[PDB]
Amino acid sequence: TASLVKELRERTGAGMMDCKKALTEANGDIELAIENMRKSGAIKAAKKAGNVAADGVIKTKIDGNYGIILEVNCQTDFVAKDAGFQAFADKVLDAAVAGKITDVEVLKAQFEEERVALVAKIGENINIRRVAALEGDVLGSYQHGARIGVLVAAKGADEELVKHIAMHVAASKPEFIKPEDVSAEVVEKEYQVQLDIAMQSGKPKEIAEKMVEGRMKKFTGEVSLTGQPFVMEPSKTVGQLLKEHNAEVTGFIRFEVGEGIEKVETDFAAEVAAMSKQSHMSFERTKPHVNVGTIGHVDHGKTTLTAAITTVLAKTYGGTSHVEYDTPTRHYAHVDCPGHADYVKNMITGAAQMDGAILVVAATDGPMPQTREHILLGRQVGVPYIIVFLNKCDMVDDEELLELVEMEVRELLSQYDFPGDDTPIVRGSALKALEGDAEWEAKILELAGFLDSYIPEPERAIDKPFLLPIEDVFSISGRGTVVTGRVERGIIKVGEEVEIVGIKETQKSTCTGVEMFRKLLDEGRAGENVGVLLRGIKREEIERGQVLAKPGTIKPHTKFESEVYILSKDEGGRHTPFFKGYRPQFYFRTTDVTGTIELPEGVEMVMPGDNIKMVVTLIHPIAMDDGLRFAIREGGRTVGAGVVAKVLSGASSRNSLSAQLRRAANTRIEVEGNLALSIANDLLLAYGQSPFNSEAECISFSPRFDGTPDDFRINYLKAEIMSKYDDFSLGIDTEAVAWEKFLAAEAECALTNARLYRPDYSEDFNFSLGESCIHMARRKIAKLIGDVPSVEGMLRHCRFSGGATTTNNRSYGHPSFKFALPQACTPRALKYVLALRASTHFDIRISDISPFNKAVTVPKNSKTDRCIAIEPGWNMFFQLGIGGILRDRLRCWGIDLNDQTINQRRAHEGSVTNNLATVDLSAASDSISLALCELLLPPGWFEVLMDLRSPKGRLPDGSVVTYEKISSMGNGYTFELESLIFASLARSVCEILDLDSSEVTVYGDDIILPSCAVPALREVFKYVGFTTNTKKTFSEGPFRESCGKHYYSGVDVTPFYIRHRIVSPADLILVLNNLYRWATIDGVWDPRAHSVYLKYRKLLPKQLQRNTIPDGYGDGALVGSVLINPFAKNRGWIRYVPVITDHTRDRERAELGSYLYDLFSRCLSESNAIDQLICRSNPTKISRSTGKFDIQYIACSSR
Ligand SMILES: [Mg+2]
């Protein structure tokens, strides 16, 4: 009978088919069946311990000054926080205190019976693992939710102190209590093993020794509660925080749930895909994308059901680790929720929201104790609609036991404010439906049947009440103020009435038009990147950040309560917790806005990597409503994100310090002679190295390529370092040399334009390696390229940018001064610009129209200046057109040009391996002869190339040259060309020699191809024109150089260069820093140099020798430790440090060319953690930078 297997099910907690089946064994007896199930119930447990128990809680209790902590494990998050699992792990914590139990086995078997009294009721491997206890004079404890627990005994302190040092251990994981506790053997050998780390690298004993130890000193220092900067005052270690207060800590004990256990990683997608790999062996894009989630008990089959849905909906219909399947009416994305917290994170971050859960319980057992914890997770995230699937029903012969389980779950729902009476509950098997069984097949379709109707359609984005995050405001002359944005939702039809609400008293206005770059429309449609014309509203009555919304739609607020996830260390978030007074920025779709946050009832600290519900109160209002995502930002970097739940009702730095630094900074450091040249020699001397004798030498010294690695790295830094110093007096040297050079660039280029049209050797015998490769080249080339540049790719890849155009100058470089002022044009190229004009309603003016560019002079070395090209600005628009397609294409040859990392890497392989060589090319971009050009190019190309090319050039000297080269460096494509031209050329040498074409990788005149290929590439290059650098091409050294990394037998031997005469503090602060990077092995000096560094650091204004920043945060300060910074004030939990900026007066942008720039972009952007998505690219502001400096406060973290 059914009505009586419920009295036995509601007194045990065990299963429903373990209640009706153990009841037929007691012939029908109540206390009989319960006792039989008892003993037959520890086989369940034993059957369980074959699963990994990873989650679970931690518990702590202290008696006067005797405390204890034990972590009891489960296998699921949800369980760890259930009604019952707390009652058990709380009793095994209370009886561990009184009856004090250090030895673990004691209570594991003293409870062992009541431990199978859970595994039975719940069905999770629950093993009360390790326990210990500590006692001191005053011993305190800290508890972070329940995932991690600290036990700290400190003989000599009060209560506020241990609470806080419990929290510092809680969030810092010190392994030892002091830097001496170090296993005197674990240290007598990790120093005798790191003593090679540098002793092999060639360093002389006493350096490796001192180095290993300075290192080993920190190795310890940091991992020890002594040398661990306190977590609420990082500017001082707990070492001094402890000695400064009366105390000392006798010991500490920190357990974190799950530590040590592996728990192999799970992948819901392939796991359901490979599960149905057994049963797989038997115009309409407008459909809504409703995603769902399966939530429930680990092995009640959320996974075997999520399989049946997919195959059964496969033989019945059409088509962030989310599996997906189809229905006639809509498209579904399914996700599993094996973790309460782990879910929250995904829903806050936006990696997967949810429209409708699907609680999967198995009717074999009915609801579990912790199925309320499931319904919970769903109530909290506020999932609108839940549907329950009752699984494995074939195994209930009695049909009244089903409307019983239904009964049980149908109320668990309504204890949690879901329509527990009215909700769909389908009864079927997830597995019988896998075996192609029609009667249990259609119960699956029965669920996907409910997917269609009960989980309501999400409101389409273009259906909501119009909104557009204003990203910029221009004052167009003759056309009235205008904003540019992307319409978030809704529609705006030219002539309707909008509001501009957010940061300032909400204002209103009216739409006077809608236009793109190409076509001018009359309405904006959600999803589009449009600009919107207004009237009766000036351009300083608007700010990037407020929204353009239909009136009443949305209102500005300053106080709201939200729930955010703050990023872990790994995820590039904070590496340091924060507390009561967090004062960050909160990025809202388009702009940072500072705020102040108040934790909830109980949380006092927050750690990098946990979730949180908090009350954000910003400085000024912002337009919003619930469902809106906001990034949590810190001086530029995201360290969190979070969503908005309820809109509550909304109620340091210095004078002469910011200014005391400013002075310093501006001061001119001063010295007799060549400062740089001395900082050199004193470093040469520091390393035992006969110093430079005359300025003459700094640049005429040639390394030796033997010595140990160390014996080189120095000698190398010695040859290089000074090389590019612009200020050497000693020198009949000029830039007249520079043109003398560029003048044979032609004289050569000619000869090769000549050579390259005439090879018919009077006979048939002669076959030369040149002809051949250019022949393979042409073919290879064409295969990759196309017959001629499509237009589809000409219009996304054309763009303005950079600085100098024949019309604009360095100062008017920004792309808006290219749309602002009318730009030159080669005769030929004209058409293109007309074709552009023919495609926008804005007026693509052109200024003059010459075949002329400007040849010029830019300092580069000491022994020569550099020749470059300032092109017609409309040519360049288009020269970067094909530039960017020669880019996209060169990828099929494995060449990426955005990435000079996959070209230094190999430089280093070659220095150990000796197989790849590095070549280096002299007259690079300045020798690609027109001859060679067409020989290799589809002519469809070689034309659109001769078009955009600049043909003649205008010198400084007033004189002219007409070009022998097809391009000079600075031509909008002269890069992606020479790359492809050299790549093909090598890739063809490769074939001629049976070497892998796959081995040639390139970037500029920096080529890497296999070492044997090199001697041909020499004759092959000799022929086509290029004059190769025998000196800087290494096909056999211990040494390769490529893309700014140099290498010696696999170590880095790159130098750094002293480019300018050093006279500013910003100037020295640099050099000292690059000497810092060049000689540190992770914060740890090499003595030989730490001497010369220190010395010269004393040339600085005082305040400036102690002002230090981490690494890769600038050169506006000395790289060093930021906790030692005296000026560094920790505001609002975020450590703002001060650095030297370059000083810049504001200038006025062309509101139109700045506007055209903005909208051409929306176009180009239209023709192209998980949190970059709530982020933009920003408006245009100008400035000419004075020689003066300035001091900016930024945002830091200690490492
Ligand atoms: Mg190079």
mmCIF file of C-alpha atoms in Angstrom, residues 44-227:
data_model
loop_
_atom_site.group_PDB
_atom_site.id
_atom_site.type_symbol
_atom_site.label_atom_id
_atom_site.label_comp_id
_atom_site.label_asym_id
_atom_site.label_seq_id
_atom_site.Cartn_x
_atom_site.Cartn_y
_atom_site.Cartn_z
ATOM 1 C CA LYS A 44 24.945 2.744 0.919
ATOM 2 C CA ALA A 45 27.632 4.815 2.628
ATOM 3 C CA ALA A 46 30.401 2.357 1.713
ATOM 4 C CA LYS A 47 29.107 2.403 -1.859
ATOM 5 C CA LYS A 48 29.473 6.182 -1.658
ATOM 6 C CA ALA A 49 33.128 6.666 -0.659
ATOM 7 C CA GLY A 50 34.064 5.858 -4.264
ATOM 8 C CA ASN A 51 33.069 9.424 -5.173
ATOM 9 C CA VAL A 52 35.148 12.577 -4.651
ATOM 10 C CA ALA A 53 34.068 14.700 -1.670
ATOM 11 C CA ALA A 54 35.300 18.221 -2.427
ATOM 12 C CA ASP A 55 32.944 20.822 -0.921
ATOM 13 C CA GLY A 56 31.700 21.134 2.691
ATOM 14 C CA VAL A 57 32.029 23.556 5.612
ATOM 15 C CA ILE A 58 34.462 24.520 8.372
ATOM 16 C CA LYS A 59 33.697 24.967 12.078
ATOM 17 C CA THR A 60 35.379 26.694 15.044
ATOM 18 C CA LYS A 61 34.754 26.852 18.846
ATOM 19 C CA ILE A 62 36.830 28.402 21.673
ATOM 20 C CA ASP A 63 36.511 27.899 25.447
ATOM 21 C CA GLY A 64 38.007 30.777 27.413
ATOM 22 C CA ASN A 65 41.252 30.129 25.554
ATOM 23 C CA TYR A 66 40.922 26.561 24.300
ATOM 24 C CA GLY A 67 39.714 26.385 20.683
ATOM 25 C CA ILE A 68 39.156 23.901 17.851
ATOM 26 C CA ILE A 69 38.369 23.681 14.104
ATOM 27 C CA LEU A 70 37.320 20.792 11.832
ATOM 28 C CA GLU A 71 36.382 20.607 8.155
ATOM 29 C CA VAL A 72 33.699 18.066 7.323
ATOM 30 C CA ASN A 73 33.355 17.352 3.607
ATOM 31 C CA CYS A 74 30.458 16.691 1.267
ATOM 32 C CA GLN A 75 30.564 16.571 -2.526
ATOM 33 C CA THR A 76 28.141 19.385 -3.350
ATOM 34 C CA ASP A 77 28.022 23.065 -2.460
ATOM 35 C CA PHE A 78 24.240 22.978 -1.925
ATOM 36 C CA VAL A 79 24.588 20.305 0.755
ATOM 37 C CA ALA A 80 27.230 22.193 2.741
ATOM 38 C CA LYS A 81 24.571 24.795 3.580
ATOM 39 C CA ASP A 82 21.496 22.583 4.064
ATOM 40 C CA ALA A 83 19.105 22.392 7.059
ATOM 41 C CA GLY A 84 20.599 19.052 8.103
ATOM 42 C CA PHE A 85 24.278 19.002 7.115
ATOM 43 C CA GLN A 86 24.819 21.914 9.496
ATOM 44 C CA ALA A 87 23.128 20.097 12.399
ATOM 45 C CA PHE A 88 25.509 17.140 12.002
ATOM 46 C CA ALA A 89 28.736 19.087 11.480
ATOM 47 C CA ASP A 90 27.695 21.260 14.443
ATOM 48 C CA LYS A 91 27.249 18.311 16.810
ATOM 49 C CA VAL A 92 30.574 16.785 15.722
ATOM 50 C CA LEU A 93 32.076 20.188 16.580
ATOM 51 C CA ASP A 94 30.351 20.630 19.956
ATOM 52 C CA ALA A 95 31.252 17.133 21.178
ATOM 53 C CA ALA A 96 34.818 17.660 19.958
ATOM 54 C CA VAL A 97 35.290 20.665 22.279
ATOM 55 C CA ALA A 98 33.980 19.328 25.608
ATOM 56 C CA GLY A 99 35.282 15.814 24.991
ATOM 57 C CA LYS A 100 38.444 17.257 23.456
ATOM 58 C CA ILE A 101 39.496 15.221 20.427
ATOM 59 C CA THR A 102 42.802 15.931 18.692
ATOM 60 C CA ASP A 103 43.298 12.462 17.205
ATOM 61 C CA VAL A 104 41.002 12.268 14.181
ATOM 62 C CA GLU A 105 39.928 8.616 14.189
ATOM 63 C CA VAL A 106 38.297 9.151 17.580
ATOM 64 C CA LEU A 107 35.197 10.985 16.344
ATOM 65 C CA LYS A 108 35.129 9.533 12.820
ATOM 66 C CA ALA A 109 34.178 6.176 14.386
ATOM 67 C CA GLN A 110 32.469 7.593 17.507
ATOM 68 C CA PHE A 111 29.984 9.118 15.061
ATOM 69 C CA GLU A 112 30.530 6.609 12.223
ATOM 70 C CA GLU A 113 27.053 5.195 12.828
ATOM 71 C CA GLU A 114 25.237 8.524 12.684
ATOM 72 C CA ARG A 115 27.407 9.252 9.622
ATOM 73 C CA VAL A 116 25.643 6.563 7.610
ATOM 74 C CA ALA A 117 22.487 8.178 9.043
ATOM 75 C CA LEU A 118 23.013 11.049 6.597
ATOM 76 C CA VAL A 119 24.572 9.487 3.493
ATOM 77 C CA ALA A 120 21.372 7.441 3.518
ATOM 78 C CA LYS A 121 18.895 10.314 3.784
ATOM 79 C CA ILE A 122 20.857 12.539 1.385
ATOM 80 C CA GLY A 123 23.053 10.398 -0.843
ATOM 81 C CA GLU A 124 26.313 12.326 -0.885
ATOM 82 C CA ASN A 125 29.763 11.105 0.135
ATOM 83 C CA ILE A 126 30.053 12.893 3.473
ATOM 84 C CA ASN A 127 33.326 12.194 5.315
ATOM 85 C CA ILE A 128 34.247 14.275 8.380
ATOM 86 C CA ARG A 129 37.887 14.640 7.406
ATOM 87 C CA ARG A 130 40.843 16.072 9.376
ATOM 88 C CA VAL A 131 40.477 17.906 12.705
ATOM 89 C CA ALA A 132 42.916 19.619 15.062
ATOM 90 C CA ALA A 133 42.909 22.090 17.965
ATOM 91 C CA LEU A 134 45.058 24.900 19.358
ATOM 92 C CA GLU A 135 45.353 26.653 22.715
ATOM 93 C CA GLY A 136 47.223 29.800 23.677
ATOM 94 C CA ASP A 137 46.796 32.608 26.178
ATOM 95 C CA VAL A 138 44.473 34.711 24.053
ATOM 96 C CA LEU A 139 43.529 32.653 20.990
ATOM 97 C CA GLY A 140 41.070 34.120 18.459
ATOM 98 C CA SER A 141 39.137 32.911 15.409
ATOM 99 C CA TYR A 142 37.815 34.204 12.078
ATOM 100 C CA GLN A 143 35.128 32.593 9.914
ATOM 101 C CA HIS A 144 34.616 33.536 6.243
ATOM 102 C CA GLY A 145 31.057 32.401 5.489
ATOM 103 C CA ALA A 146 32.109 28.800 6.111
ATOM 104 C CA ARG A 147 34.556 27.894 3.342
ATOM 105 C CA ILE A 148 37.705 28.764 5.249
ATOM 106 C CA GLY A 149 38.532 28.879 8.975
ATOM 107 C CA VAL A 150 41.447 30.225 11.009
ATOM 108 C CA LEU A 151 42.658 29.379 14.507
ATOM 109 C CA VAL A 152 45.196 31.784 15.973
ATOM 110 C CA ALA A 153 46.830 31.585 19.423
ATOM 111 C CA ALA A 154 48.695 34.729 20.461
ATOM 112 C CA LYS A 155 50.201 34.864 23.955
ATOM 113 C CA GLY A 156 50.354 38.613 24.603
ATOM 114 C CA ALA A 157 47.401 40.284 22.925
ATOM 115 C CA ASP A 158 43.776 41.446 23.300
ATOM 116 C CA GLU A 159 40.652 40.575 21.237
ATOM 117 C CA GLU A 160 40.586 43.205 18.490
ATOM 118 C CA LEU A 161 44.124 42.139 17.655
ATOM 119 C CA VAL A 162 43.526 38.363 17.180
ATOM 120 C CA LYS A 163 40.263 38.930 15.284
ATOM 121 C CA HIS A 164 42.366 40.958 12.858
ATOM 122 C CA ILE A 165 45.376 38.594 12.788
ATOM 123 C CA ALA A 166 42.922 35.733 12.325
ATOM 124 C CA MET A 167 41.720 37.645 9.274
ATOM 125 C CA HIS A 168 45.235 38.302 8.005
ATOM 126 C CA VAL A 169 46.035 34.583 8.201
ATOM 127 C CA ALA A 170 42.565 33.876 6.887
ATOM 128 C CA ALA A 171 43.570 35.904 3.847
ATOM 129 C CA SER A 172 47.303 35.318 3.327
ATOM 130 C CA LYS A 173 47.967 31.642 4.075
ATOM 131 C CA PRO A 174 51.217 32.024 6.053
ATOM 132 C CA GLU A 175 52.825 28.559 6.267
ATOM 133 C CA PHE A 176 55.040 29.517 9.221
ATOM 134 C CA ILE A 177 54.509 31.889 12.135
ATOM 135 C CA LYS A 178 58.022 33.354 11.781
ATOM 136 C CA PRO A 179 60.834 33.317 9.171
ATOM 137 C CA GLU A 180 63.014 31.044 11.351
ATOM 138 C CA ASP A 181 60.595 28.122 11.666
ATOM 139 C CA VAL A 182 61.814 27.221 8.183
ATOM 140 C CA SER A 183 62.534 23.513 7.941
ATOM 141 C CA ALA A 184 66.313 23.896 8.289
ATOM 142 C CA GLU A 185 66.601 21.143 5.674
ATOM 143 C CA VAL A 186 63.907 22.415 3.291
ATOM 144 C CA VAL A 187 66.170 25.473 3.127
ATOM 145 C CA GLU A 188 69.683 23.979 3.223
ATOM 146 C CA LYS A 189 68.748 22.408 -0.141
ATOM 147 C CA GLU A 190 66.369 24.774 -2.018
ATOM 148 C CA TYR A 191 69.274 27.251 -1.713
ATOM 149 C CA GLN A 192 71.713 24.542 -2.827
ATOM 150 C CA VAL A 193 69.399 23.987 -5.832
ATOM 151 C CA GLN A 194 68.707 27.619 -6.753
ATOM 152 C CA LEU A 195 72.480 28.134 -6.384
ATOM 153 C CA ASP A 196 72.695 26.599 -9.860
ATOM 154 C CA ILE A 197 69.748 28.580 -11.265
ATOM 155 C CA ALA A 198 72.322 31.335 -11.613
ATOM 156 C CA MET A 199 75.668 29.520 -11.239
ATOM 157 C CA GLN A 200 75.127 27.882 -14.618
ATOM 158 C CA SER A 201 73.932 31.165 -16.206
ATOM 159 C CA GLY A 202 77.634 32.007 -15.755
ATOM 160 C CA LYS A 203 77.429 34.304 -12.720
ATOM 161 C CA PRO A 204 80.521 34.177 -10.408
ATOM 162 C CA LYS A 205 79.948 32.136 -7.239
ATOM 163 C CA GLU A 206 79.484 35.010 -4.767
ATOM 164 C CA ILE A 207 76.791 36.517 -6.988
ATOM 165 C CA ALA A 208 74.752 33.355 -7.339
ATOM 166 C CA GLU A 209 75.359 32.927 -3.625
ATOM 167 C CA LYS A 210 74.325 36.436 -2.565
ATOM 168 C CA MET A 211 71.565 36.367 -5.162
ATOM 169 C CA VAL A 212 70.112 33.016 -4.240
ATOM 170 C CA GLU A 213 70.092 34.231 -0.667
ATOM 171 C CA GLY A 214 68.589 37.668 -1.177
ATOM 172 C CA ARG A 215 66.023 35.593 -3.029
ATOM 173 C CA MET A 216 65.828 32.851 -0.420
ATOM 174 C CA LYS A 217 65.525 35.610 2.175
ATOM 175 C CA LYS A 218 62.278 36.770 0.548
ATOM 176 C CA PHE A 219 61.143 33.235 -0.292
ATOM 177 C CA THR A 220 60.945 33.000 3.489
ATOM 178 C CA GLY A 221 60.177 36.573 4.499
ATOM 179 C CA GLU A 222 56.932 36.622 2.525
ATOM 180 C CA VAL A 223 55.524 33.141 3.271
ATOM 181 C CA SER A 224 55.757 33.838 7.010
ATOM 182 C CA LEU A 225 53.221 35.706 9.160
ATOM 183 C CA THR A 226 56.192 37.820 10.224
ATOM 184 C CA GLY A 227 57.154 39.094 6.780
#
